Amino acid sequence: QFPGLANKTYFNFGGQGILPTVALEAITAMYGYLQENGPFSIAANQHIQQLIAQLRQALAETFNVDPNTITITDNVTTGCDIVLWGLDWHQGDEILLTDCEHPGIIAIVQAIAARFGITYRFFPVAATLNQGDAAAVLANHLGPKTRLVILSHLLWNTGQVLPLAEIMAVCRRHQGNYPVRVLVDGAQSAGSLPLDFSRLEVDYYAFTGHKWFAGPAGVGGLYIHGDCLGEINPTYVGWRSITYGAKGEPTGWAEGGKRFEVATSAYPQYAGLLAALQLHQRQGTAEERYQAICQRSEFLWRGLNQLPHVHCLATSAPQAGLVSFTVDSPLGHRAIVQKLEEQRIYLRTIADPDCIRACCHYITDEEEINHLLARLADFGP
Amino acid sequence: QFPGLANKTYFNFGGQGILPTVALEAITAMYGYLQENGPFSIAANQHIQQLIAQLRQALAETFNVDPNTITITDNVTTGCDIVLWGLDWHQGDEILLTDCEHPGIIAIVQAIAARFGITYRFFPVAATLNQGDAAAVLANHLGPKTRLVILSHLLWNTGQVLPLAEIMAVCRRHQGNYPVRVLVDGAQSAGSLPLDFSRLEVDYYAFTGHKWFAGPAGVGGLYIHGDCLGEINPTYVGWRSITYGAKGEPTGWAEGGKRFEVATSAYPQYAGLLAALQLHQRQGTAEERYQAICQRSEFLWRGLNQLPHVHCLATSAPQAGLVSFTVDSPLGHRAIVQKLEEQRIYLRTIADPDCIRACCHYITDEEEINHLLARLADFGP
Ligand SMILES: *Cc1c(COP(=O)(O)O)cnc(C)c1O
Ligand SMILES: *Cc1c(COP(=O)(O)O)cnc(C)c1O
Ligand SMILES: [K+]
Ligand SMILES: [K+]
Structure with a gap:
């Protein structure tokens, strides 16, 4: 669909x-x-x-x-x-x-x-x-x-x-x-x-x-x-x-x-x-969809916590679908979002605080999350 | 087109x-x-x-x-x-x-x-x-x-x-x-x-x-x-x-x-x-299209002047594509516009003054105008 x-x-x-x-x-x-x-x-x-x-x-x-x-x-x-x-x-x-x-x-x-x-x-x-x-x-x-x-x-x-x-x-x-x-x-x-x-x-x-x-x-x-x-x-x-x-x-x-x-x-x-x-x-109901959304965002958030050069703004699991984080790299977040789009991975640069934001929906799957995590892993200090 | x-x-x-x-x-x-x-x-x-x-x-x-x-x-x-x-x-x-x-x-x-x-x-x-x-x-x-x-x-x-x-x-x-x-x-x-x-x-x-x-x-x-x-x-x-x-x-x-x-x-x-x-x-240029629009509106206006029970509001040729008119009939303009739509002829009822409005564009042709004229001829006092 x-x-x-x-x-x-x-x-x-x-x-x-x-x-x-x-x-x-x-x-x-x-x-x-x-x-x-x-x-x-x-x-x-x-x-x-x-x-x-x-x-x-x-x-x-x-x-x-x-x-x-x-x-x-x-x-x-x-x-x-x-x-x-x-x-x-x-x-x-x-x-x-x-x-x-x-x-x-x-x-x-x-x-x-x-x-x-x-x-x-x-x-x-x-x-x-x-x-x-x-x-x-x-x-x-x-x-x-x-x-x-x-x-x-x-x-x-x-x-x-x-x-x-x-x-x-x-x-x-x-x-x-x-x-x-x-x-x-x-x-x-x-x-x-x-x-x-x-x-x-x-x-x-x-x-x-x-x-x-x-x-x-x-x-x-x-x-x-x-x-x-x-x-x-x-x-x-x-x-x-x-x-x-x-x-x-x-x-x-x-x-x-x-x-x-x-x-x-x-x-x-x-x-x-x-x-x-x-x-x-x-x-399903709004509640079932919301839980599906959180399960996806926590899986992504947990994945990001494991990458040594990524730092999630949230220290506890996300309460919704938005997962914001920073990346330790000389490149800067705009260049990283751009490079990611070069690989057909779509995230957004946030102006304040200076970070990158990922949105997980109930239609997002773990394969897409793992892919993001694999390509994000390529950046570093 | x-x-x-x-x-x-x-x-x-x-x-x-x-x-x-x-x-x-x-x-x-x-x-x-x-x-x-x-x-x-x-x-x-x-x-x-x-x-x-x-x-x-x-x-x-x-x-x-x-x-x-x-x-x-x-x-x-x-x-x-x-x-x-x-x-x-x-x-x-x-x-x-x-x-x-x-x-x-x-x-x-x-x-x-x-x-x-x-x-x-x-x-x-x-x-x-x-x-x-x-x-x-x-x-x-x-x-x-x-x-x-x-x-x-x-x-x-x-x-x-x-x-x-x-x-x-x-x-x-x-x-x-x-x-x-x-x-x-x-x-x-x-x-x-x-x-x-x-x-x-x-x-x-x-x-x-x-x-x-x-x-x-x-x-x-x-x-x-x-x-x-x-x-x-x-x-x-x-x-x-x-x-x-x-x-x-x-x-x-x-x-x-x-x-x-x-x-x-x-x-x-x-x-x-x-x-x-x-x-x-x-x-064509705006001027050519305007002249074509007027050619059509005047042709329509002229035809309406020939119908005994139709009365165009304008007594000289229209200056643009709009031609409003009243119809001498017991029906009322709203009922007439609805009967016309039933025949797939599309005009507009005007509240003030109480009349009917037709719009001719440069893409409007003579057969369409004559068909409209044909259908209006039926209404009478
Ligand atoms: C997207 C966004 C808006 C702007 O939305 P529009 O539909 O373009 O008006 C406003 N506020 C927040 C917090 C947003 O995320
Ligand atoms: C159609 C019309 C409007 C309304 O146009 P919108 O695009 O719906 O705002 C306003 N004034 C006149 C003279 C109109 O004929
Ligand atoms: K981390
Ligand atoms: K007439």
Whole structure:
């Protein structure tokens, strides 16, 4: 089902997932349906709306929530933009971010700091990979003017799974000027960690379909708890954001998460993500998949611990699919990732901390891991 | 080149254009390249950057401007959102829009009005299709606090091509608290009218690739004149919006239009738009295609004038590919458009004014028009 795995040794699922055949087929089929019936017509427009509804519903079931809490976007970042720009920011309001957030999210925060006179600071979580408590660290920085905390559930650089429940509790418990809310960047967590927003209390959770869920680049989504929807004012809007009157005039916002959806999107892509989501559900529960992922990452991590010139950032087994490490070599990590790609082995260079990252998915096998280990063994001081 | 045309009588290019074979081949080829070489890898990441540059350059050439003035988006609306959310609004600032604008664009204006305390007022252009002067109407509405004027170069409802150069002169001649700027919604104009932004002076021009350009749904763009770039602050941003520091940290805004590009997008669809753009240039110059479009629209317009129960809104030949008309019948335009679709004849119901719209492209032929005419003859009072 994942053709792309053959003839390469892929560990970059956290960059982009390998697109399954069923997903490509659905994308191709959707273009065919539009050619045959439209592309712009009563039949085609209806089919597109039915497809959007099917995808919204599939995402809702994925996280065990009502479809009205799901917004379809193009990527992780957009979800973050929706939440951040939607909040009614007042000068001096404060935003706390872990020191392991994505450059693009930081950039939104900076744009918002400059726009509403808000402030932001980082709390050190990187250092808690092997010790400490990121929740305790957060508390330590929580203030009276803190309004929003931004954190990645699974860190893209170190592979740490942040203690989300305790960080939420720490946040509820807090008594300040604002009820502290938490925007979660789920780029790495969604599709790898089992996520249930019924059993797990979340405020905002942005994710994408193109990484661990293995859908095509260009389709992602955003979860907003019903109790937080009101606080989020639509910002980028368009014809998909509203309801219409008798003369075709705007008459209010569309139902639930639809108000944050803009206008024409690559619909066939939606069918691709739908197919990819349905495939993963065909392969055991989220929990069984997560355990499969950890068994692969621990096997790789254990393998790396045995190589004399490789040093894993994690001193205990990885809590998810991300395994970061450094290599003792004059070459530098970029040259090593490049040479590895020369041999059709795909890993990623991490900018901070300066290291290399490997992603193991439930479709990764030991043979691919042993291959990586054999070629990594070639580097040294 | 446009397989979708056979076996239907399509007049809905203004809704979505028929996708040419070369575009579907480029889309498919891009998924294949990602499968073979990535999808996330040095080779794949470079191939995508090269693709984005090629598309940005082809758009730049289409409008005869420098690539730095072009932002790639997913649709017309996003271009309007970028400009509107980026201007430094102050309470009391006023926006004028024609009474023929898209409901989605009015929705952004109301959100801005609500967020920055600006005000908006409509000016009547719909009634200027056959008489009067849209620029003069705008002159009679310009005020002391007028900062921006929003208008569609080609009206999606009546098919009128507004006198843009004259409107620009009017705005530039006006003396008030602000240099009056103009945001053009080019959803119908781009890809049908020949547009040269070095000959035609323009401030902000939003467009999409999925209508007259015949690209796939999900890719569009925005033009911003070099002297206005400084006035548009980035709003929705992400990793594609910035320049980077030695440690992977954000250090500024990316060059030119890139500052308004966010994050992961439907890259194979970009190759699709690129191939469609190239196909049109191979058919003839923008001017030749425009003349062919008008030849078709006038032939259609003429035929409709001969039918006793059909009444074209335009009393002189259409200035572009859009031909709107009403039908004297107890059925109602929506029911008529549905009956036509049942016969695989594709038109669009217009909410205001209450009419039907047909779109003729350079690929439309006489047999299709005559067949449409044949079927409309059946409706009567
Ligand atoms: C991939 C990634 C993003 C960016 O994702 P897009 O889908 O391109 O927005 C954001 N954050 C983290 C932590 C990532 O790993
Ligand atoms: C079609 C259309 C739009 C909407 O285009 P999207 O690409 O879906 O944003 C906006 N304005 C006019 C005048 C249109 O005809
Ligand atoms: K080791
Ligand atoms: K007539």
